[PDB]
Amino acid sequence: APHMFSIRKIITISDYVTMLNIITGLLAILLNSFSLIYLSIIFDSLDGYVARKTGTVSDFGAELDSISDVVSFGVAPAYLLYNNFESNLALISAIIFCLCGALRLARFGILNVKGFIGLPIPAGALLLVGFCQLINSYLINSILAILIGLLMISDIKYPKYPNKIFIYIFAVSLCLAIVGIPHFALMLCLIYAIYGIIKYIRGD
Amino acid sequence: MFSIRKIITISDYVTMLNIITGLLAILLNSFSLIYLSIIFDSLDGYVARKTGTVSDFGAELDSISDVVSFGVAPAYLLYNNFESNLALISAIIFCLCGALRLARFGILNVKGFIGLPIPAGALLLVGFCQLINSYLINSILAILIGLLMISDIKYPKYPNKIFIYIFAVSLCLAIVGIPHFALMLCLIYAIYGIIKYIRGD
Ligand SMILES: CCCCCCCC/C=C\CCCCCCCC(=O)OC[C@H](COP(O)(O)(OC[C@H](N)C(=O)O)OP(=O)(O)OC[C@H]1O[C@@H](n2ccc(N)nc2=O)[C@H](O)[C@@H]1O)OC(=O)CCCCCCC/C=C\CCCCCCCC
Ligand SMILES: CCCCCCCC/C=C/CCCCCCCC(=O)OC[C@H](O)CO
Ligand SMILES: CCCCCCCC/C=C/CCCCCCCC(=O)OC[C@H](O)CO
Ligand SMILES: CCCCCCCC/C=C/CCCCCCCC(=O)OC[C@H](O)CO
Ligand SMILES: CCCCCCCC/C=C\CCCCCCCC(=O)OC[C@H](O)CO
Ligand SMILES: CCCCCCCC/C=C\CCCCCCCC(=O)OC[C@H](O)CO
Ligand SMILES: CCCCCCCC/C=C\CCCCCCCC(=O)OC[C@H](O)CO
Ligand SMILES: CCCCCCCC/C=C\CCCCCCCC(=O)OC[C@H](O)CO
Ligand SMILES: CCCCCCCC/C=C\CCCCCCCC(=O)OC[C@H](O)CO
Ligand SMILES: CCCCCCCC/C=C\CCCCCCCC(=O)OC[C@H](O)CO
Ligand SMILES: CCCCCCCC/C=C\CCCCCCCC(=O)OC[C@H](O)CO
Ligand SMILES: [Ca+2]
Ligand SMILES: [Ca+2]
Ligand SMILES: [Cl-]
Ligand SMILES: [Cl-]
Ligand SMILES: [Cl-]
Ligand SMILES: [Cl-]
Ligand SMILES: [Cl-]
Ligand SMILES: [Cl-]
Ligand SMILES: [Mg+2]
Ligand SMILES: [Mg+2]
Numbered sequence: 001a002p003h004m005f006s007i008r009k010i011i012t013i014s015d016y017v018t019m020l021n022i023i024t025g026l027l028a029i030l031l032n033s034f035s036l037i038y039l040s041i042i043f044d045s046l047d048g049y050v051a052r053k054t055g056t057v058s059d060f061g062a063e064l065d066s067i068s069d070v071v072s073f074g075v076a077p078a079y080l081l082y083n084n085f086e087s088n089l090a091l092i093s094a095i096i097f098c099l100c101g102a103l104r105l106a107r108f109g110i111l112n113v114k115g116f117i118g119l120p121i122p123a124g125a126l127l128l129v130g131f132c133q134l135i136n137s138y139l140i141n142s143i144l145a146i147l148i149g150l151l152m153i154s155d156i157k158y159p160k161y162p163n164k165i166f167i168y169i170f171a172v173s174l175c176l177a178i179v180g181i182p183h184f185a186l187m188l189c190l191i192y193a194i195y196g197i198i199k200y201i202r203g204d
Numbered sequence: 205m206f207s208i209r210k211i212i213t214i215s216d217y218v219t220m221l222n223i224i225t226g227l228l229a230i231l232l233n234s235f236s237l238i239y240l241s242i243i244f245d246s247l248d249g250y251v252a253r254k255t256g257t258v259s260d261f262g263a264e265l266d267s268i269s270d271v272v273s274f275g276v277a278p279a280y281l282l283y284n285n286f287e288s289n290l291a292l293i294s295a296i297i298f299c300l301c302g303a304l305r306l307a308r309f310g311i312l313n314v315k316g317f318i319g320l321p322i323p324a325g326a327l328l329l330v331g332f333c334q335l336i337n338s339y340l341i342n343s344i345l346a347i348l349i350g351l352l353m354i355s356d357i358k359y360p361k362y363p364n365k366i367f368i369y370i371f372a373v374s375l376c377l378a379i380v381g382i383p384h385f386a387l388m389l390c391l392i393y394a395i396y397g398i399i400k401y402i403r404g405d
């Protein structure tokens with residue numbers, strides 16, 4: 001309503017990181033690049049940190065963070081699975097995956113302080129793109145796409161903030177994943193995901 | 205294990221069909237599924253209010269579905285079918301602008317639209333892409349739509365029964381390969397919005 005482009009008046013320096021995230025997420029689809037999903041995970045960790053450090057946390061930025069997660073962690077991995085493993089089964093699996101990412105983002109939007117309920121969408125997306133790069137099988141990667149989707153919409157608790165050590169080596173491994181070597185990021189992400197399930201089943 | 209199923213409404217299932225068609229617009233490279241998404245996007249909130257199943261989860265899933273169907277998929281459909289540096293940058297701006305207005309809309313609760321609504325933007329881009337064989341012109345329009353989408357131009361939220369009667373038919377005509385009337389109806393809506401803003405009335 002105010003003249004033409006009043007939306008610049010609510011954009012912060014954090015939103016610019018978020019937009020970088022949206023670009024890398026969209027380019028993951030447009031260029032068929034797993035490499036850019038790993039960059040998206042780095043940016044998705046960076047935009048909330050910049051918000052808190054620079055003191056520019058905003059509701060608009062919180063919403064754009066989620067919207068960015070849809071592109072890069074919900075649409076893009078499902079696109080990358082189908083485009084690189086074209087089959088009826090990977091079509092249905094990419095659909096489940098994206099839908100499961102969408103529902104946990106919808107559930108995250110309503111309640112989000114406790115931690116992570118279910119596998120967080122950046123971690124799900126890393127698992128899928130990791131499996132897609134290291135396993136040359138549409139059936140298996142189609143199967144895992146559903147298993148990740150089901151974890152994402154689970155009640156399985158996952159901690160929100162890794163320790164300094166884990167951030168440190170996970171940060172390195174995501175960049176190593178950016179340059180073609182995803183094993184350490186995929187391995188680190190499995191341990192996180194599998195440990196969550198074990199705790200749930202064990203009841204601890 | 206799966207307490208989420210206690211939250212799902214029957215309108216959420218509509219929203220999920222919307223996400224599916226909007227995702228399949230990307231995966232199958234289908235302009236015609238963008239038009240079905242617009243129909244589903246108008247159906248899920250209607251079914252929500254009609255069935256008494258309005259929820260906050262569903263309000264969010266509705267926006268999340270617009271990201272896929274109307275932000276990501278049209279930018280994809282522009283770059284995939286007009287591969288070029290110019291279309292790449294325009295796809296990026298289109299999507300960014302769709303994301304920014306969805307973010308603004310997410311923190312808003314107003315009677316009309318502020319800026320061009322993202323389903324209307326997605327329609328113009330997809331229509332132009334089908335009826336204009338020119339990456340440059342389509343690349344230009346993508347940016348012009350993005351700017352409209354994040355603008356302060358006021359657009360009405362619910363059309364009159366006559367307009368939705370004709371628009372609905374024209375969306376299905378668009379689905380079977382004839383987008384002219386949907387695109388033409390969407391242009392009247394957008395350009396009339398611009399004129400009223402410029403006129404100031
Ligand atoms: C093809 C066959 C298939 C079917 C058959 C066909 C049947 C036919 C019938 C219907 C078909 C549709 C008819 C056309 C209407 C399309 C509307 C549209 O074009 O697309 C609409 C979005 C959707 O609307 P919106 O999306 O903003 O959602 C807000 C936001 N997304 C959020 O969710 O927060 O609002 P919603 O009603 O969906 O629900 C809002 C709330 O519902 C709750 N909620 C929601 C979900 C949930 N699971 N649970 C919840 O509880 C929840 O509370 C939510 O907040 O908007 C628009 O009008 C875009 C405007 C585009 C207008 C441009 C076209 C111009 C047309 C005419 C111009 C006139 C020209 C002059 C004419 C003269 C010459 C002739
Ligand atoms: C993506 C799937 C799309 C599916 C179709 C979308 C349109 C909704 C149709 C309703 C028909 C009547 C159903 C009403 C009675 C069934 C109750 C119900 O749907 O509940 C589900 C429950 O939450 C278990 O998860
Ligand atoms: C693709 C097929 C054709 C496309 C067109 C799709 C039409 C969908 C209509 C839904 C209305 C459902 C009727 C709702 C009946 C009442 C259910 C209910 O429980 O309503 C509670 C409410 O509070 C009481 O006013
Ligand atoms: C602070 C960190 C910021 C880092 C930077 C992020 C900026 C946003 C990303 C833009 C990618 C642009 C992708 C499009 C690539 C343009 C170059 C190109 O297309 O090349 C033209 C040449 O003519 C071909 O032969
Ligand atoms: C690739 C590596 C990227 C690394 C990214 C670096 C992010 C930190 C940069 C600036 C923070 C400080 C900026 C100063 C702006 C104002 C800060 C402020 O006032 O915040 C205090 C807040 O209230 C708390 O209590
Ligand atoms: C309510 C209206 C319905 C909405 C529901 C969504 C609409 C799109 C659904 C299907 C399009 C075609 C789906 C893709 C079919 C693939 C064709 C096939 O057989 O797959 C090839 C296979 O690899 C061997 O060649
Ligand atoms: C013809 C081409 C189109 C083919 C389309 C194939 C995919 C549709 C199949 C299932 C969707 C599942 C919906 C998303 C996952 C379930 C959502 C949900 O509500 O989960 C409830 C609970 O977690 C469990 O009971
Ligand atoms: C050794 C660890 C150090 C590495 C730290 C890196 C930090 C992030 C910097 C740049 C990432 C941007 C790279 C963008 C890559 C473009 C990918 C692409 O365009 O597509 C791939 C193509 O399909 C295949 O040929
Ligand atoms: C290929 C898949 C096609 C799927 C179908 C076509 C597209 C969906 C359109 C309309 C669904 C109408 C929804 C049916 C609403 C029934 C009313 C109702 O039963 O609502 C009770 C409510 O749950 C209170 O408890
Ligand atoms: C912090 C770093 C953040 C960086 C974020 C973005 C990373 C780079 C992404 C894409 C590379 C550009 C890909 C450009 C591909 C087309 C350019 C080109 O050469 O075009 C070929 C021909 O001229 C016409 O088809
Ligand atoms: C005159 C209008 C009468 C009513 C109109 C009917 C409404 C259509 C409803 C569902 C069809 C779903 C559309 C199927 C499109 C999926 C196929 C696909 O995506 O293929 C890509 C490309 O178009 C391959 O040629
Ligand atoms: Ca974030
Ligand atoms: Ca809607
Ligand atoms: Cl504005
Ligand atoms: Cl959560
Ligand atoms: Cl998440
Ligand atoms: Cl659950
Ligand atoms: Cl608005
Ligand atoms: Cl909108
Ligand atoms: Mg994010
Ligand atoms: Mg929607």
